[PDB]
Amino acid sequence: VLSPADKTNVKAAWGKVGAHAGEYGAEALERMFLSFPTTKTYFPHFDLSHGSAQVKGHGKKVADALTNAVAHVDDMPNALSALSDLHAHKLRVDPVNFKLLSHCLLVTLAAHLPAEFTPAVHASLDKFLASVSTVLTSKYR
Amino acid sequence: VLSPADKTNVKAAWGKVGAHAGEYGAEALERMFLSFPTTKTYFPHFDLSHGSAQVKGHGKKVADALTNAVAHVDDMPNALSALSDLHAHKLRVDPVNFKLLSHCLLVTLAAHLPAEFTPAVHASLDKFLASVSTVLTSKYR
Amino acid sequence: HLTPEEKSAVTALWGKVNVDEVGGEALGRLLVVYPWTQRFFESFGDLSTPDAVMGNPKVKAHGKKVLGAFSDGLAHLDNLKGTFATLSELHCDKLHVDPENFRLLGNVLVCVLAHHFGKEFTPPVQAAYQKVVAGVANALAH
Amino acid sequence: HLTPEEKSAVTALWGKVNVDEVGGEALGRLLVVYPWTQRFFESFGDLSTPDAVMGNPKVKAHGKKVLGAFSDGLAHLDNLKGTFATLSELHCDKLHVDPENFRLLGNVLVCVLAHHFGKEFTPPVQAAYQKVVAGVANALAH
Ligand code: HEM
Ligand code: HEM
Ligand code: HEM
Numbered sequence: 001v002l003s004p005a006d007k008t009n010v011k012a013a014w015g016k017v018g019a020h021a022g023e024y025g026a027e028a029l030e031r032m033f034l035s036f037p038t039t040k041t042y043f044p045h046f047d048l049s050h051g052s053a054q055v056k057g058h059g060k061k062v063a064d065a066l067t068n069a070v071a072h073v074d075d076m077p078n079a080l081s082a083l084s085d086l087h088a089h090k091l092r093v094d095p096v097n098f099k100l101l102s103h104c105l106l107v108t109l110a111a112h113l114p115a116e117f118t119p120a121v122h123a124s125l126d127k128f129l130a131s132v133s134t135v136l137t138s139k140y141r
Numbered sequence: 142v143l144s145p146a147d148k149t150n151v152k153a154a155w156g157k158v159g160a161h162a163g164e165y166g167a168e169a170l171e172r173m174f175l176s177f178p179t180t181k182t183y184f185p186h187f188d189l190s191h192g193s194a195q196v197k198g199h200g201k202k203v204a205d206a207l208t209n210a211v212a213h214v215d216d217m218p219n220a221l222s223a224l225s226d227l228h229a230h231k232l233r234v235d236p237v238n239f240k241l242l243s244h245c246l247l248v249t250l251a252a253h254l255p256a257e258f259t260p261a262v263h264a265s266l267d268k269f270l271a272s273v274s275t276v277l278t279s280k281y282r
Numbered sequence: 283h284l285t286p287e288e289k290s291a292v293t294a295l296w297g298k299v300n301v302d303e304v305g306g307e308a309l310g311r312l313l314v315v316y317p318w319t320q321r322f323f324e325s326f327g328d329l330s331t332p333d334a335v336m337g338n339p340k341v342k343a344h345g346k347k348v349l350g351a352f353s354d355g356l357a358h359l360d361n362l363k364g365t366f367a368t369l370s371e372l373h374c375d376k377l378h379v380d381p382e383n384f385r386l387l388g389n390v391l392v393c394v395l396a397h398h399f400g401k402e403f404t405p406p407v408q409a410a411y412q413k414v415v416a417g418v419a420n421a422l423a424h
Numbered sequence: 425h426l427t428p429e430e431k432s433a434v435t436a437l438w439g440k441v442n443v444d445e446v447g448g449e450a451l452g453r454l455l456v457v458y459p460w461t462q463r464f465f466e467s468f469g470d471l472s473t474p475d476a477v478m479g480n481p482k483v484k485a486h487g488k489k490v491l492g493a494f495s496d497g498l499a500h501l502d503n504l505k506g507t508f509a510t511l512s513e514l515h516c517d518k519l520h521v522d523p524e525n526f527r528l529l530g531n532v533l534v535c536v537l538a539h540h541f542g543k544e545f546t547p548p549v550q551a552a553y554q555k556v557v558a559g560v561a562n563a564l565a566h
């Protein structure tokens with residue numbers, strides 16, 4: 001459960017990401033594929049080489065979805081219901097993998113936005129990504 | 142996130158517990174202390190011997206709280222805000238321990254209510270206890 | 283790890299387990315309660331509902347083999363990491379089963395034993411079985 | 425576990441870590457981001473806010489010792505379970521630190537390295553450090 005302070009923190013941080021959200025999404029996916037190679041088993045038909053245009057386009061989709069999760073942070077089950085259908089019903093992604101991509105996103109934000117990534121923001125972002133992860137892995141519709 | 146079917150399941154199952162909720166709460170605590178002895182470190186001033194009256198009284202309090210969580214399953218953060226203050230702010234219970242007591246409660250319900258504990262109910266109860274656990278371990282107020 | 287009194291408890295109850303049924307009931311509940319585990323059993327056919335899962339023949343036949351291996355573990359409680367070495371290879375090399383899932387199946391098996399034995403699955407007996415299923419989960423993690 | 429090129433990467437970056445500061449920044453963030461870990465450090469004084477935690481002298485002095493032990497691990501990457509044997513005893517026998525927490529500190533340290541080195545903490549370098557902090561977390565679990 002997010003505090004009201006957590007929500008202000010996440011809105012402010014993600015706002016700073018801005019028009020770089022695509023490139024950050026792509027970098028986080030590349031970090032997750034390289035550090036945790038079992039995650040590649042969910043993307044068999046993808047080209048997952050470095051600089052792949054499929055990863056670049058997927059990273060953009062993942063980022064746009066998080067932007068939308070941020071704008072509906074009070075009503076996330078309802079704003080993410082189609083992604084949830086895809087991740088929990090169709091793909092059956094093991095919940096452990098959400099912890100992995102969450103970590104790779106925090107690492108990406110720490111490397112690129114060091115002044116924004118204070119301990120208070122780090123703590124809010126971490127709670128936000130856990131809550132997004134819980135909605136994506138639950139069948140509730 | 143609970144489905145609407147999950148909520149019907151939990152209400153019906155817990156309803157069957159009835160006036161035995163106290164004795165079930167106490168049995169679940171005794172199972173958790175015996176199977177996972179590190180959990181005793183949170184109760185240093187308790188008598189934790191078998192048949193202890195302190196465990197019996199605590200088991201009743203834990204059960205009454207779950208009854209109330211069930212009756213406010215749509216608004217749990219608000220119905221459990223004082224327990225959350227106690228578990229997350231004051232006691233600092235490590236979240237791993239909530240998985241342990243959740244398992245000991247499922248085992249207690251399986252041993253006593255075998256006809257109610259079908260696979261569908263088992264799945265609903267498990268999701269309910271994870272959601273109660275997430276509210277108790279979060280600082281959001 | 284186990285006390286001589288714990289080993290006797292674990293053994294006595296296991297003598298009363300139906301080995302044609304319990305393995306299936308456990309694998310069945312794993313797929314219903316933690317539905318992402320259905321990804322590893324796509325070849326088993328219809329897993330669309332709980333009634334479908336619990337009645338699937340292939341789930342029942344596979345649960346028998348899982349319970350067979352738990353039985354081999356209870357006969358070699360002192361040498362679990364040797365009994366399960368080939369089996370750790372298979373779950374990691376061919377499938378990649380995240381080791382958290384091994385802990386989840388062990389806990390579903392304890393619930394199914396609770397369910398079958400009722401008041402005979404006392405807190406002391408449960409505490410002996412928690413040691414055995416943690417044992418087995420750790421020897422599978424690769 | 426590590427490739428000769430991975431070991432060289434891990435070593436080169438570690439030569440540039442401030443060993444007076446990074447350990448504290450990591451222990452500090454662990455207490456702020458996962459607040460139940462504050463229970464293990466009740467004797468350290470005021471941990472009431474993030475600014476309090478990050479400025480606590482005792483958190484800084486203790487983070488130096490934690491980072492000292494990670495350094496000893498990087499010098500004995502082939503024999504991690506021996507380097508950390510006394511230390512596993514302490515976290516389990518005297519405290520009971522649930523081993524999930526060791527994995528959380530390792531991941532907070534990777535974030536702090538990311539934060540300090542920026543574009544130099546490339547995906548290949550991160551993947552080498554993930555292997556080292558998983559190594560260390562496993563040798564601490566008792
Ligand atoms: C914050 C976490 C995540 C977000 C926001 C997210 C978001 C998305 C989005 C927006 C899509 C594409 C939806 C569409 O085009 O219809 C997608 C597809 C997908 N996601 Fe995720 N995802 C996340 C985590 C994960 C993780 C952890 C995995 C696996 C390790 C995963 C595997 C997939 C796969 C396999 C696809 C389908 C790709 C394709 O078939 O083209 N996702 N995700
Ligand atoms: C569903 C999970 C849980 C529920 C519903 C629950 C509920 C409660 C309730 C109702 C109280 C007493 C509140 C009061 O009298 O003011 C309580 C106190 C407490 N709980 Fe929990 N609890 C849960 C899980 C846990 C776990 C996992 C631990 C530790 C392993 C724990 C440790 C404590 C302690 C130490 C107290 C204080 C006892 C005392 O000081 O007298 N609780 N809990
Ligand atoms: C925890 C105790 C477990 C034991 C004792 C166990 C035991 C077994 C055994 C005996 C086999 C068959 C080996 C053979 O015939 O050569 C097997 C296969 C398999 N196990 Fe497990 N297993 C366990 C947990 C899991 C978990 C948690 C999963 C997945 C979530 C899983 C997925 C599989 C799959 C996919 C196969 C191959 C089945 C097939 O190809 O039809 N197992 N396991």
Ligand code: HEM
Pocket residue numbers: 461464465486489490493494511515519521525526527529530560561564
């Ligand atoms: C994961 C890598 C970790 C390493 C390398 C590490 C290392 C250390 C070291 C070197 C000491 C001091 C040993 C001595 O002076 O004799 C220590 C003490 C301690 N560690 Fe850790 N530790 C780790 C994780 C954790 C975690 C996750 C916790 C708690 C959540 C924790 C809690 C403690 C506490 C309470 C002490 C005793 C401090 C005191 O009494 O002042 N450690 N650890």
